[PDB]
Amino acid sequence: SNYVIQADQQLLDALRAHYEGALSDRLPAGALFAVKRPDVVITAYRSGKVLFQGKAAEQEAAKWISGASASNETADHQPSALAAHQLGSLSAIGSDEVGTGDYFGPIVVAAAYVDRPHIAKIAALGVKDSKQLNDEAIKRIAPAIMETVPHAVTVLDNPQYNRWQRSGMPQTKMKALLHNRTLVKLVDAIAPAEPEAIIIDEFLKRDSYFRYLSDEDRIIRERVHCLPKAESVHVSVAAASIIARYVFLEEMEQLSRAVGLLLPKGAGAIVDEAAARIIRARGEEMLETCAKLHFANTKKALAIAKRR
Template identity: 60%
Template sequence: MANHVIAASAALLEQMRNHYASDITEHLPAGALFVAKRPGCTITAYRSGKVLFQGKAAEQEAAKWLEPSEQKKAAAPQPRLSAASAIGSDEVGTGDYFGPVVVAAAYVAKEQIETIVAMGVKDSKQLTDEAIRRIAPALMNHIAHQTVILANQKYNDWQRSGMPQTKIKALLHNKAIAMLMERLSPIKPEAIIIDQFIERDLYFRYLEGETNIVRDRVYCYPKAETVHIAVAAASIIARYVFLQEMERLSQKVGMTLPKGAGAQVDQTAAKLMQMHGPAILELCGKLHFANTKKAVQIAKQQ
């Protein structure tokens, strides 16, 4: 079960009590102000000002209650950041049933920015797979980068242990950035920009206990590819590596694996189970997705 703790002022505690009024339960642990139970999350607020969120939806629920000052600090762009020598970091594969999670970190020095833009680098979601395959090799030869690939079997192990996907992403981003920083040394980037999937505060809470945490000059921005071209470069590299991994997995299981998590994925997963048995999905799928149950039902009906 995922656990998240935030610090709340007296005013925020009262606001939370009002917000969760219809979900508050009668039984209180020692020192608690209130306990509220919502689908996927139990919220326990303590007199000390600490608020504990527990359950599958804990990280999303906790993120709603960051203090305004924290939100502003995380969101406020730094002046002239787009012209800095920076590392950008982005991930691919978290919304796809088949295939691994791939995180890429890419370093673009300020004197490389114009060249990278001229190469056609932009957010990978705006590019076709054909364009990704054309641009990525030249880009990877031109800039320092690091990728981290989390195979499906390891992903499923982490997920079964109760690790939320947001923590998985935090661990992978930090690892890719740390490895790239080691390769760049003694060069130090002026900024490290992560395409935001969670607030900066929670990102670092997920990394507590890790031995090598990159903290200095780290920023988390929504649509970070518009903040610095290094993030767009990272998104292209991550997508390219993901496409390669999907091709490798497709060859291994003897069937083309579709991207996404739609109905075509359900049908493909069902056919794979019929061909190889249910264990095959451990190798190539993210088992906690709803697609697994749908595929099982389809396989039984056929």
């Protein structure tokens, strides 16, 4: 009977560093390392799952955690890691968007193509968990990525955003279109070369994604992979996220300057106050150039502006 446990980063590091001669090659999808011990085999996965197989399975597990539960589970491929295992080391294009939830500013979509020989370099930039990175880190990392790897960007300015919106196009359709047109730009820019894979986050069903591109004159579908939390599948995705955020910050700086008032991020109370200040200082129509009007924030700001 095998035993399983859930190990945090500290437990995984200890487990690996503990025994001598841990193996890392030819392992199942998701597996980090495997240890060949007498009467027991240890296998650790990205998810933190650690499998103990063998006669001394229960004895070995107890050496690390109390409450080692028994399982029929075997040291096999993890479904959550099947794509990453195959796509991880391929030269791929990755895309991501930003600004969809920001009342002020546009929606920015970026695509990045990381060729096999550039994977390590990009990864060395600490692109992992780009979400945690602050704006100052984005300004230092982004430019380094943009000069090392080819990329494409499509910016949906507010005036055009509002125009598509008042005609009935939902944000979802906006994102799909922006992704498709950005991938088109990058695919053409890197030709004759061709990406081994093209990864897009599953911000919506694949079927719905392409359905939205029905009228597109050019649709990139060949070798397109729609995966959840894709930035964990290939570095090109994390690269695209960082680039998108950098461009967004840039657009906001320029937008704040055109409007003449610092535009905060998000759609919280401060945003409503800011918009009220804009309405009073530059007029209501100024929002058409810098905000996503259909947002609830617009009505809230209008009230604040008229109250005094």
